Swiss-Prot record:
Quaternary assembly: Interacts with RAD54L2/ARIP4. Interacts with CRY2. Interacts with RANBP9. Interacts with WDR68. Interacts with SIRT1.
Name of the featured protein: Dual specificity tyrosine-phosphorylation-regulated kinase 1A
Active-site positions on this chain: 152
Ligand binding (ATP): 30-38, 53, 103-106
Length: 341
């Protein structure tokens, strides 16, 4: 297997302490995925820690990573300070038949941060800081020259720069694409998957704003807003909160009948699979708008007022629009009264 460098998964066999090109000292494995592995390495030449993503020695993964390199170079080269919300690709090289992407070293992901709260959530003030940064990232990605859909926004793909600050970056553009001939594919992690993708409809940059709405509620409550066991359970959990999607969406949706029934009058209802009736699990109640925030845990805390929670709820409801056309766009998210401080 690759002169004994590769296992039967086409992954490089990582050896702690190995030195590459008389430059990089591999410290440890920090990550693993379909793509391959991520290692922590000390770059002797630049005198700094780096994260090296070691792509599997297999053509399809190498070709996908060449797309990831192309998008990262597009973003990293833009002449705006908004690009600092995206992880920096320092360089890439071919080493022992593996494509290696060399990234800046970031810190814990937002899932680690949730685990650190014991899944009770961070304050509304810290939620606001994360929301403002992510909306600015999505504003950047939707620049016409870029038109990048991340396609896998989730707490695990949002990393703190460092353990002390609220500064964050988006990582893992390995599944990302540029807006093009709009096509359906089975994409996004299920809990964060937009209704258009669940419904088998073609997708655009709005799927990232849906994922963001879900992420922001989770960051405050400590738990996923829509934790589906499968796609039917996922859509049923979305309907518990948001009600039956508009008829004009379901009338155009190839998978409408996986989840919904069209009745003789042209109206739609849930298919029989249990669940709260449609719209009974209000975001008003999930956030504890009038009852001291999630599980009443923010009762008499600064910047956790009914007015604050009403502004948060209104922003999330605009991010969780069933219609990708009227779903709030990043610029207007940033002008929302939730950010007026």
């Amino acid at each position: 297997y690759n002169d004994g460098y590769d296992d039967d998964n086409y992954d490089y066999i990582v050896k702690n302490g190995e030195k590459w090109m008389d430059r990089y000292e591999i410290d440890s494995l920090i990550g693993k995925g379909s793509f391959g592995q991520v290692v922590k390495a000390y770059d002797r030449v630049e005198q700094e820690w780096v994260a090296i993503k070691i792509i599997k020695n297999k053509k399809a993964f190498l070709n996908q990573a060449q797309i990831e390199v192309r998008l990262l170079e597009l973003m990293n080269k833009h002449d705006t300070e908004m690009k600092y919300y995206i992880v920096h690709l320092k360089r890439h090289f071919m080493f022992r038949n593996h494509l290696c992407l060399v990234f800046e070293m970031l810190s814990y992901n937002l899932y680690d941060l949730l685990r650190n709260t014991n899944f009770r959530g961070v304050s509304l003030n810290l939620t606001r800081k994360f929301a403002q940064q992510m909306c600015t990232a999505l504003l950047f990605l939707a620049t016409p020259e870029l038109s990048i859909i991340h396609c896998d926004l989730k707490p695990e793909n949002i990393l703190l720069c460092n353990p002390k600050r609220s500064a964050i970056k988006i990582v893992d553009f390995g599944s990302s694409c540029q807006l093009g001939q709009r096509i359906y594919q089975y994409i996004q992690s299920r809990f964060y998957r937009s209704p258009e993708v669940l419904l088998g409809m073609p997708y655009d940059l709005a799927i990232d704003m849906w994922s963001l709405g879900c992420i922001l509620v989770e960051m405050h409550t400590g738990e996923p807003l829509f934790s589906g066991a499968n796609e039917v359970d996922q859509m049923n959990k979305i309907v518990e909160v948001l009600g039956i999607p508009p008829a004009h969406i379901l009338d155009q949706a190839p998978k409408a009948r996986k989840f919904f029934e069209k009745l003789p009058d042209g109206t739609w209802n849930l298919k029989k699979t249990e669940y709260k009736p449609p719209g009974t699990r209000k975001l008003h109640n999930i956030l504890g708008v009038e009852t001291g925030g999630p599980g009443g845990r923010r009762a008499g805390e600064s910047g956790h007022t009914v007015a604050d929670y009403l502004k948060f709820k209104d922003l999330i409801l605009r991010m969780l629009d069933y219609d990708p056309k009227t779903r709030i766009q990043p610029y207007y998210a940033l002008q929302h009264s939730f950010f007026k401080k």
